[PDB]
Design a protein around this nucleic acid. Structure first.
Ligand SMILES: [Mg+2]
Length: 904
RNA sequence: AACCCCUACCAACUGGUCGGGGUUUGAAACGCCAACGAACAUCAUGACAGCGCCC
RNA sequence: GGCGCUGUCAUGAUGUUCGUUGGCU
């Protein structure tokens, strides 16, 4: 919107006043407006924007801002006091969440608390995707008999001394006989699993660095890490781990688990410092021997500038200055000589970047001091600002280089000696105990994930905490003095956690598999590419593994895209998901056509493999390239190993894994959204119970998870005991509403008389639905149309199907059983279709008794036309009916995906 | 685009024309130039081990 | 010592998606 970027950020309500906010430094906020009655009382000296009363006091005609409307129309901001008192949450749960989170402090006559609470609510839902992926990764690697790190596996409240030997530590168990034997079985399983060579795929969590080769830690650390991951799983989905576990960590966990988290944080931070101080000892030795300056301060800027982010808004590429600087004849041996400079390329480039940055900073500081001494009107812009202005004025690529060459030349004229010397040849991180356990556990969670997921998670968490801290800073100035209850007391120091997460981002990267677990990785690699050898002979080839063998080792074990799918390891399966030549077209077609749509200017992704597989010639068309590589993705059997034609299968390994990676990640992301939906329905059921409504929470599993939708839909019509009374009440209320219509809205009553006699019959039929809508409990299910749709849906639900849907969504069965039913789909046009076809097939496998009628017809449809049925999905999203946006986004193809909106 | 709110005329009001607002809706609060950090793939570059061919 | 390609890493160059800073109307 134009008003938001125009200079207006938020419009808050406290008491009878209105508190606008214009932007401030970073994500913070500054108060600029005070609206009361019909008055204008802008506070700041410099008016960021001007607003005045609009017509009928229904808004503010914002104007005289930085930039105006492109087509010349008034921009009006809604008055929050127009309707009446403070607007309510669409779910109608403002008071209960305010009381739960802020206790009795929150008065309730404000509009800032429930904006802070929703950020915590989004923190609760973001971690679902990443814990789902992390738990699936460990689940796949061993412990596949029944489950590992599940809802009943590990408790992180049992000390390892009390876990290994329950007999000697029976004091805390109150002398129980079943639990001790169950935990003995669990300890047997853990001891068997800890020695598994398959455990090497994960990095610093389990196999730690000692010297040239990784060494497994003691069982204490691994047991603690598994227990903590199981504790995260327990906290998210609900026992000593309630809904407030991660928020209260130090006082809840035993000293041993906190010791393990401190050990991991110390490991990573100390590794960074020791590396960049004495293991990259050449860099520090150059840092000390650079100029006549204090070594400690120089190192303090060097480390803070290199690894962290401080380049900020200086406005130009330093690296291209250094490129022009290297282009000269004096330092040509940097490129000409490859014997010695190759191992110090990064050091040299970083040092040149640092010295340029430091020169610019020092000049800026000196010029700023001079200008502060001088009058403000006459300002010396200095060289960095004149350079920025020159770059801004230019509008040609080559002309930019014409402007840009001179700066490098003159700085070389100034920086001769240090560059000649380079060419010729105070701990900062926050301890290991001051950091909260939340940050360490987030790091441990990221340590199981992929490169992109880490960045997404930490970026979103940082943004949410910045929002929280800015709102907390705004709270006192607007007259709200609500405080934090002891249970939810973690959110007071949101800024500190934000800083810790920023540092984690500065060192949160992938761990990468070990080099000691190669023996099992050969087995999994040969399994993925269609092996068919007998398992006795296959284990024989495994033990003898360490002809085409050498190819497997050298060109397979270390494949970059191999470490992206093995983390989702399904050895026995996963070769039948890219086996039918009707789903490879879709993923390749989509990526090549849309994602790499700018391959017209060079070698694309599919273009490279097409060129190397067709015979290094031919340029027919994109579609012919999509339908030619699929026949090479399909039938990637190991059993074959005219030889040149067979070599294509070796030639196209790196795309196979990419296809499987896309498919699996899309499936798990969709499943994670469905898990988010069910977590939301559970928490909303609990909240509606706490508010004081009529609900049965114990029998929520038995009923088809439709308790919340049934309650929020309004009056009850499923019970056949008093249908006559309900019908009579609705009829009399509709009749009363129709009779007293002129006083309600005279304009409609004026036209009502001219209607025909039968149109009155339709009007009464619709007024019955109108009254049933009036008898509801929610804002979403208050308009008649969605209420009648949901009411029609509710009458046709089968509870066992819903229960199976929920159980298989939570248990992640689809990502573990996809191989069974994927070859019986004729056409695929969206990931939605594939996921849901798998869903109805898994529901197929069980429900074959006592389902005569609608569900029977729908499953008949899946078996025959081999395409997922939209109506079955619409009946299976009934548990999601109290939030209409979510109900649509999880049942309509067009509205599911934000990226996919152009075609629909 | 979905979903809720708002001015002006129409309008069963379960619907529309010129438009605005929404961190308190769903994974979801901001017109260009000029830069920063993460991941994706291609060209060129020296070094590594290898799948096969010639002297 | 060469012909064809694949796979790791470090330097460099170009295009896409998310999120950040300063300037312009
Ligand atoms: Mg929100």
């Amino acid at each position: 919107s134009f008003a938001k970027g125009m200079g207006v950020k938020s419009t808050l309500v406290s008491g009878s006043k209105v508190y606008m906010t214009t932007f401030a430094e970073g994500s913070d906020a500054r108060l600029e407006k005070i609206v009361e009655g019909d008055s204008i009382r802008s506070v700041n000296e410099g008016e960021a924007f001007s607003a005045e009363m609009a017509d009928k006091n229904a808004g503010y005609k914002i104007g005289n801002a930085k930039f105006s409307h492109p087509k010349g129309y008034a921009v009006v901001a809604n008055n929050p006091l127009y309707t009446g008192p403070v607007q309510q949450d669409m779910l109608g749960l403002k008071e209960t969440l305010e009381k739960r989170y802020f206790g009795e402090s929150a008065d309730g006559n404000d509009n800032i608390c429930i904006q802070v609470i929703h950020n915590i609510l989004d923190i609760e839902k973001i971690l679902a995707e990443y814990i789902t992926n992390a738990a699936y990764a460990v689940n796949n690697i061993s412990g596949l008999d029944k489950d590992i790190i599940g809802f009943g596996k590990f408790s992180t409240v049992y000390t390892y001394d009390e876990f290994k030997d329950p007999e000697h530590h029976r004091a805390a168990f109150n002398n129980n006989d079943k639990l001790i034997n169950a935990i003995k079985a669990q300890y047997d399983e853990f001891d068997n699993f800890l020695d598994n060579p398959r455990l090497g795929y994960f990095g610093q969590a389990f196999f730690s660095k000692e010297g040239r080769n990784y060494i497994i830690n003691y069982g204490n650390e691994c047991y603690d890490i598994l227990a903590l991951l199981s504790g995260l799983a327990h906290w998210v989905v609900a026992s000593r781990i309630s809904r407030t576990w991660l928020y209260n960590l130090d006082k809840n966990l035993d000293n041993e688990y906190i010791s393990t988290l401190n050990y991991l944080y110390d490991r990573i931070t100390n590794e960074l410092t020791n590396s960049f101080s004495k293991n990259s000892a050449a860099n520090v030795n150059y840092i000390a021997e650079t100029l006549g300056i204090n070594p400690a301060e120089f190192a303090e800027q060097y480390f803070r500038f290199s690894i962290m982010k401080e380049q900020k808004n200086l406005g130009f590429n330093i690296t291209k200055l250094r490129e022009v600087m290297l282009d000269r004849k004096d330092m040509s041996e940097i490129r000409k000589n490859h014997k010695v400079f190759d191992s110090i390329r990064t050091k040299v480039y970083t040092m040149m970047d640092f010295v340029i940055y430091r020169y610019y900073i020092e000049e800026d500081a000196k010029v700023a001091a001079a200008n502060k001494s001088l009058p403000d009107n006459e300002k010396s812009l200095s060289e960095k600002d004149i350079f920025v202005i020159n770059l801004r004025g230019s509008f040609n690529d080559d002309q930019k280089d014409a402007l840009y060459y001179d700066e490098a030349n003159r700085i070389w004229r100034k920086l001769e000696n240090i560059m000649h010397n380079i060419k010729e040849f105070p701990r900062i991180l926050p301890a290991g105990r001051d950091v909260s356990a939340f940050s360490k556990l987030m790091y441990a969670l990221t340590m199981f994930l992929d490169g992109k997921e880490i960045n997404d998670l930490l970026t979103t968490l940082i943004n949410k905490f910045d929002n929280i801290q800015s709102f907390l800073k705004v709270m006192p100035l607007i007259g709200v003095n609500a405080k934090f209850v002891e249970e939810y007391a973690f959110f007071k120091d949101s800024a500190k956690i934000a800083d810790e997460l920023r540092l984690i981002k500065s060192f949160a990267r992938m761990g990468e598999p070990i080099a000691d677990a190669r023996r099992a990785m050969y087995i999994d690699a040969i399994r993925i590419l269609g092996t068919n050898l007998s398992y006795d002979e296959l284990k024989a080839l495994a033990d003898t593994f360490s002809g085409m063998r050498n190819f497997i080792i050298n060109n397979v074990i270390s494949n970059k895209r191999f470490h992206y799918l093995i983390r989702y390891g399904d050895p026995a399966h996963l070769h039948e998901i890219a086996k039918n030549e009707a789903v490879v077209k879709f993923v390749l077609g989509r990526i090549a056509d849309i994602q790499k749509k700018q391959g017209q200017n060079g070698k694309n992704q599919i273009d490279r493999y097409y060129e190397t597989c067709i015979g290094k010639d031919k340029g027919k068309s994109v579609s012919e390239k999509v339908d030619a590589l699929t026949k090479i993705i399909t039938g990637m059997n190991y059993d074959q190993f005219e030889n040149a034609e067979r070599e294509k299968f070796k030639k196209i390994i790196s795309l196979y894994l990419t296809v499987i990676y896309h498919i699996l990640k899309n499936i798990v992301n969709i499943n994670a959204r469905y898990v988010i939906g069910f977590h939301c329905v559970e928490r909303d059921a609990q909240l509606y119970k706490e508010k004081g409504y009529d609900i049965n929470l114990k029998k929520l599993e038995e009923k088809g998870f439709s308790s919340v939708t049934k309650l929020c839909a309004g009056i009850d019509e499923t019970a056949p005991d008093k249908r006559k009374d309900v019908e009579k009440e609705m009829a009399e209320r509709a009749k009363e509403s129709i009779d007293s219509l002129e006083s309600a809205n005279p304009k409609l009553y004026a036209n009502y008389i001219k209607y025909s006699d039968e149109k009155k019959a339709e009007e009464f039929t619709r007024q019955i639905n109108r009254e049933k809508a009036k008898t509801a409990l929610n804002a979403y299910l208050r308009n008649t149309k969605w209420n009648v749709i949901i009411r029609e849906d509710l009458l046709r639900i089968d509870n066992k199907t819903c229960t199976l849907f929920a159980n298989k969504a939570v248990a992640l069965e689809v990502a573990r059983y996809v191989h069974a039913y994927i070859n019986d789909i004729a056409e695929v046009n969206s990931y939605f279709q594939l996921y849901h076809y798998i869903m109805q097939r898994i529901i197929m496998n069980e429900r074959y008794e006592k389902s005569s009628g609608k569900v029977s017809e729908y499953f008949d449809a899946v078996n025959d036309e081999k395409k997922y049925n939209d109506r079955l999905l619409k009946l299976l999203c009934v548990p999601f009916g109290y939030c209409i946006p979510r109900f649509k986004n999880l049942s309509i193809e067009a509205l599911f995906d934000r990226n996919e909106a152009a075609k629909f």
